[PDB]
PDB file of C-alpha atoms in Angstrom:
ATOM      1  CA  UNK A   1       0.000   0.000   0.000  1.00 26.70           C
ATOM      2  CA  UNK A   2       1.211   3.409  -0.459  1.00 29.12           C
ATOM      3  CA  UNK A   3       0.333   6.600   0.337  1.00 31.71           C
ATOM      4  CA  UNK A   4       1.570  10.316  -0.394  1.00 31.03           C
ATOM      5  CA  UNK A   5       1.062  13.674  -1.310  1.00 29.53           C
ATOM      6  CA  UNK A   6       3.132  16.874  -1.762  1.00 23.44           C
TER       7      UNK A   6
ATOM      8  CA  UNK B   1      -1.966  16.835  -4.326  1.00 22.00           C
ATOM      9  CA  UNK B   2      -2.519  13.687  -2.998  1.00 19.84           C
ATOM     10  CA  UNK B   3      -2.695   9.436  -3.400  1.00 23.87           C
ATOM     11  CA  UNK B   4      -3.661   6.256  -1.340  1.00 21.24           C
ATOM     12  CA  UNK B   5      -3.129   2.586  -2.946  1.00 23.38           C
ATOM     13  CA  UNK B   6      -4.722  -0.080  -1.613  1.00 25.56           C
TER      14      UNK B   6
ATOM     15  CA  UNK C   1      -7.874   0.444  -5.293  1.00 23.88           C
ATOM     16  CA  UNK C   2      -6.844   3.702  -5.406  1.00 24.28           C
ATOM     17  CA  UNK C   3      -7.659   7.403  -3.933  1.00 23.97           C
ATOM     18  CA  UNK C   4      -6.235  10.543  -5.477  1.00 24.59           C
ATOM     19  CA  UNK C   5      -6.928  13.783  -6.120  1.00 23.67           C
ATOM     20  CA  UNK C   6      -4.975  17.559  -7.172  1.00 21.80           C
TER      21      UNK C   6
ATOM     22  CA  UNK D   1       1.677  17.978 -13.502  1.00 22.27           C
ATOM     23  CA  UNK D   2       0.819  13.680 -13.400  1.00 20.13           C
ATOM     24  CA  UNK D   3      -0.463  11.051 -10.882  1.00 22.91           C
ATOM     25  CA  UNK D   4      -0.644   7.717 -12.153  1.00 24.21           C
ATOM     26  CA  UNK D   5      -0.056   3.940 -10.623  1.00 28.63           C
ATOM     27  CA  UNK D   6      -0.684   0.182 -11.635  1.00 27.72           C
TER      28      UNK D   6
ATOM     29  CA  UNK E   1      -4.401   1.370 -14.025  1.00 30.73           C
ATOM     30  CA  UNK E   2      -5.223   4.960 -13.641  1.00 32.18           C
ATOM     31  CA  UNK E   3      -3.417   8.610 -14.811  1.00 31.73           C
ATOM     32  CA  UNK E   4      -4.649  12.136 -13.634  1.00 32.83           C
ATOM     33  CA  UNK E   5      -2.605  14.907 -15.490  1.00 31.23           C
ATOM     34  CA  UNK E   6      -3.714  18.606 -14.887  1.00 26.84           C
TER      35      UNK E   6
ATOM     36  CA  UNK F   1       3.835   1.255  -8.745  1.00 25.10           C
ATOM     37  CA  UNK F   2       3.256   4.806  -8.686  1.00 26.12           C
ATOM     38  CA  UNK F   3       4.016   8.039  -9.577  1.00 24.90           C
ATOM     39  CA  UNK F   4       3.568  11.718  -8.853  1.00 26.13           C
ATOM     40  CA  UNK F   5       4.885  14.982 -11.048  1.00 27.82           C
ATOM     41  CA  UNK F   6       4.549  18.234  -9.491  1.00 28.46           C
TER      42      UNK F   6
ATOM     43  CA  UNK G   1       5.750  16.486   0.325  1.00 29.94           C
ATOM     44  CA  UNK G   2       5.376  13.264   1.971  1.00 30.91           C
ATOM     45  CA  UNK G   3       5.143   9.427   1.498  1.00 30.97           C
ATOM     46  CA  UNK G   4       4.488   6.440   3.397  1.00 34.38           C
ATOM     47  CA  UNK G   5       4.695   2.910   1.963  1.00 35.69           C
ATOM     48  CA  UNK G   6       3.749  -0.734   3.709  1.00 33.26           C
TER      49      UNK G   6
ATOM     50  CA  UNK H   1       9.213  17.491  -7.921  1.00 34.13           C
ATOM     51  CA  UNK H   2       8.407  13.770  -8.124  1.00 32.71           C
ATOM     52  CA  UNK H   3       7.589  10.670  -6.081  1.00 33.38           C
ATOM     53  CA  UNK H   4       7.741   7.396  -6.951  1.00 29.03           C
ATOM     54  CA  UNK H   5       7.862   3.978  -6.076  1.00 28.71           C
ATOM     55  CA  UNK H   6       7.372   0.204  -6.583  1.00 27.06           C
TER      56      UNK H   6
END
């Protein structure tokens, strides 16, 4: 699973 | 912006 | 699945 | 700008 | 997959 | 995988 | 940004 | 800016 943002 | 893998 | 959004 | 995943 | 480009 | 471009 | 895999 | 992963 992965999860990100920016 | 922004991401979720599942 | 998958959750994104910008 | 680019989200993408498989 | 999926792709989001903006 | 996955991939994000800002 | 910011990213958290598992 | 970019974030990946696999």
């Amino acid at each position: 699973g992965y999860m990100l943002g920016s």
